[PDB]
Scaffold this motif. Structure first.
Motif, PDB file in Angstrom:
ATOM      1  N   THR A 204       0.850  -1.188   0.000  1.00 31.80           N
ATOM      2  CA  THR A 204       0.000   0.000   0.000  1.00 31.80           C
ATOM      3  C   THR A 204       0.889   1.242   0.000  1.00 31.80           C
ATOM      4  N   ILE A 205       0.382   2.349  -0.534  1.00 30.01           N
ATOM      5  CA  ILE A 205       1.068   3.629  -0.444  1.00 30.01           C
ATOM      6  C   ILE A 205       0.072   4.577   0.222  1.00 30.01           C
ATOM      7  N   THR A 206       0.446   5.183   1.367  1.00 29.80           N
ATOM      8  CA  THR A 206      -0.411   6.129   2.063  1.00 29.80           C
ATOM      9  C   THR A 206       0.252   7.486   2.025  1.00 29.80           C
ATOM     10  N   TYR A 207      -0.493   8.499   1.571  1.00 33.44           N
ATOM     11  CA  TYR A 207      -0.057   9.879   1.534  1.00 33.44           C
ATOM     12  C   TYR A 207      -0.734  10.542   2.724  1.00 33.44           C
ATOM     13  N   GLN A 208       0.008  10.733   3.827  1.00 33.88           N
ATOM     14  CA  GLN A 208      -0.513  11.334   5.047  1.00 33.88           C
ATOM     15  C   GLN A 208      -0.189  12.810   5.122  1.00 33.88           C
ATOM     16  N   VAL A 209      -1.222  13.655   5.189  1.00 31.71           N
ATOM     17  CA  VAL A 209      -1.082  15.100   5.317  1.00 31.71           C
ATOM     18  C   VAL A 209      -0.565  15.446   6.717  1.00 31.71           C
ATOM     19  N   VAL A 210       0.562  16.136   6.756  1.00 32.72           N
ATOM     20  CA  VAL A 210       1.172  16.637   7.981  1.00 32.72           C
ATOM     21  C   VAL A 210       1.477  18.088   7.626  1.00 32.72           C
ATOM     22  N   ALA A 211       0.763  19.045   8.230  1.00 31.89           N
ATOM     23  CA  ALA A 211       0.870  20.460   7.852  1.00 31.89           C
ATOM     24  C   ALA A 211       2.215  21.114   8.164  1.00 31.89           C
ATOM     25  N   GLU A 212       2.749  20.902   9.376  1.00 32.48           N
ATOM     26  CA  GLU A 212       3.997  21.546   9.779  1.00 32.48           C
ATOM     27  C   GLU A 212       5.195  20.727   9.301  1.00 32.48           C
ATOM     28  N   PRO A 213       6.242  21.325   8.679  1.00 32.96           N
ATOM     29  CA  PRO A 213       7.416  20.516   8.301  1.00 32.96           C
ATOM     30  C   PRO A 213       8.162  19.895   9.482  1.00 32.96           C
ATOM     31  N   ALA A 214       8.168  20.563  10.654  1.00 31.14           N
ATOM     32  CA  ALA A 214       8.837  20.055  11.851  1.00 31.14           C
ATOM     33  C   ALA A 214       8.226  18.735  12.309  1.00 31.14           C
ATOM     34  N   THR A 215       6.879  18.628  12.300  1.00 32.87           N
ATOM     35  CA  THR A 215       6.142  17.405  12.684  1.00 32.87           C
ATOM     36  C   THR A 215       6.423  16.244  11.688  1.00 32.87           C
ATOM     37  N   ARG A 216       6.619  16.577  10.410  1.00 31.57           N
ATOM     38  CA  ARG A 216       6.963  15.599   9.372  1.00 31.57           C
ATOM     39  C   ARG A 216       8.370  15.079   9.620  1.00 31.57           C
ATOM     40  N   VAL A 217       9.314  15.963   9.957  1.00 33.57           N
ATOM     41  CA  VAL A 217      10.690  15.576  10.268  1.00 33.57           C
ATOM     42  C   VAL A 217      10.666  14.672  11.512  1.00 33.57           C
TER      43      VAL A 217
END
Length: 491
Positions: A204-217
């Protein structure tokens, strides 16, 4: 048991229908659900994801039959995710007046005509043969079919839903089929094990929206994501400091610039447009805000244009002395000129503007920011200078100097650029010519008129930064998308 791939993303597109989904966030999902007749082989001949070679994909073979038609022989027995067989009926429908470029079609697919050549109605010759053609000469049909216009859609399924509803339950022939969508949260796709190409390497490929770049890091470090998108050169030191993580950056085929509402008296002629252009020190901005990762194009000219890229073209001139002389010549009275920017929608938009205000101040021009808020549409009459971006979406010089600045296009019709007759005649000629000395010389001449007239001022080609685990072998491509075909292996 294949690994599930999780991508921390900046956002999701408004639609998954191939054309209505064109955006910064769409192609990375659309490219997995659909296939086109022609595929851009970004990694061919050892290229670092920036090759422009076009190769067959749903088309087994094709031959150009005249200066405006191509006969396609399609792959046989290929199925869509609903089990329907892919035939010439579907390829003709994809590029038909009914779905794409007709008057009624653009009511639900607004950019269908804007992202298309001058199409004529496709001709179905047999079950697996289709002629795709333009009404006027065009040697760009192959480049267009290998572009974000190219994805093949199922006819009967697409018709029974319409474009808007299709965008929320898409069906294609690609390696990953659509599973679910939670608006502005996630899209999940599941491996299509009936794919005509190589077996998909993720379950599966999931594209999860994470608004802040810091939270993604943070999510990449904790083990929540496999790949994260939309980072800047400033986020590279922290990510690369981890032994099991790395950044993977690339120059993208986009162009940041500023432009003018040329219906306003102060910009109805080139004089102050060119003073603003010459007073800008592009290498200082690139060094201050992009850690020297962005590229300053040597004119409206990029390597991915192929045969219409000129590597000898001199760079855009920075001349404060000439800018000062053009401000006095214009009769500029000192009235503040607004610069409309929607905050930092384009990366580093406000810091680049603040640097440019000091550069313009040195030349004797007062430019002030007009930072409009998200969800607001500033009226045309209230705009003087505004920032802009242009995706250089074909592997050709046609996009965007001809597609955005040409005759009948936005910059002349809506924003009032009075282009010289020569620029418009050369725009129509390059749309019809085959590559060679004449077409390349015409592109060189278009670039010279563009630089003298300054309907827009090119700033730089942005640098996109991804981050990923070293146990996921995937390289970015030089376009605003993600390619997993021959480019996704788990260690």
């Amino acid at each position: 048991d294949r690994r599930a791939l999780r991508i921390g993303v900046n956002g999701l597109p408004p639609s998954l229908e191939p054309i209505n989904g064109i955006s910064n966030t769409g192609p990375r999902i659309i490219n997995q659900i659909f296939d086109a007749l022609i595929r851009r082989d970004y990694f061919a001949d050892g290229a670092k994801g920036n090759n422009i070679k076009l190769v067959p994909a749903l088309a087994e073979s094709f031959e150009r039959i005249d200066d405006k038609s191509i006969r396609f022989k399609l792959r046989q027995g290929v199925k869509f995710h609903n089990g329907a067989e892919m035939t010439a009926e579907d390829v003709a429908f994809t590029f038909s007046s009914e779905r794409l470029w007709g008057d009624e079609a653009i009511k639900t697919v607004p950019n269908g005509r804007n992202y298309s050549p001058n199409w004529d109605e496709p001709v179905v010759e047999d079950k697996y043969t289709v002629v795709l053609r333009t009404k006027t000469p065009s040697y760009l049909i192959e480049k267009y079919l290998g572009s974000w216009l190219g994805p093949i859609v199922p006819k009967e399924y697409y018709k029974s839903l319409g474009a808007v509803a299709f965008g929320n339950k898409p069906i294609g022939t690609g390696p990953y089929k659509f599973r679910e969508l939670v608006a502005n949260d996630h899209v999940t796709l599941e491996a299509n094990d009936g794919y005509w190409g190589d077996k998909p390497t993720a379950s599966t490929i999931t594209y999860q929206v994470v608004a802040e770049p810091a939270t993604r890091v943070a999510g990449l470090i904790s083990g929540e994501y496999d790949i994260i998108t939309t980072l800047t050169p400033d986020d590279m030191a922290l990510v690369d400091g981890y032994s099991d993580l790395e950044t993977r950056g690339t120059l993208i085929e986009n162009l940041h610039m500023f432009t003018f509402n040329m219906n306003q008296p102060i910009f109805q002629n080139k004089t102050l447009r060119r003073a603003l252009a010459l007073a800008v020190n592009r290498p200082l901005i690139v060094e201050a805000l992009w850690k020297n990762k962005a590229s300053i194009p040597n004119g409206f000219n990029f390597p991915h244009y192929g045969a219409t890229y000129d590597p000898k073209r001199k760079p855009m001139e920075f001349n404060l002395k000439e800018a000062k002389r053009l401000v006095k010549e214009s009769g500029y009275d000192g009235t503040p000129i607004t610069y409309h920017t929607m905050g930092n929608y384009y990366a580093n938009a406000v810091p680049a503007l603040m640097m440019m205000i000091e550069m313009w101040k040195a030349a004797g021009i007062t430019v002030v920011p007009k930072i409009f808020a998200p969800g607001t549409t500033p009226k045309d009459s209230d705009i003087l200078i505004r920032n802009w971006s242009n995706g250089q979406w074909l592997t050709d010089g046609l996009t965007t100097m001809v597609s955005e600045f040409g005759p009948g296009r936005q910059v002349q019709k809506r924003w009032g650029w009075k282009a010289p007759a020569e620029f418009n005649n050369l725009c129509d000629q390059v749309a019809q010519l085959k590559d060679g000395e004449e077409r390349s010389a015409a592109f060189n001449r278009l670039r010279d008129i563009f630089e003298d007239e300054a309907p827009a001022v090119l700033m730089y080609q942005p640098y996109d930064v991804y981050a990923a685990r070293k146990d996921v072998q995937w390289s970015p491509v030089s376009f605003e998308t993600m390619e997993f075909r021959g480019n996704l292996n788990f260690k």
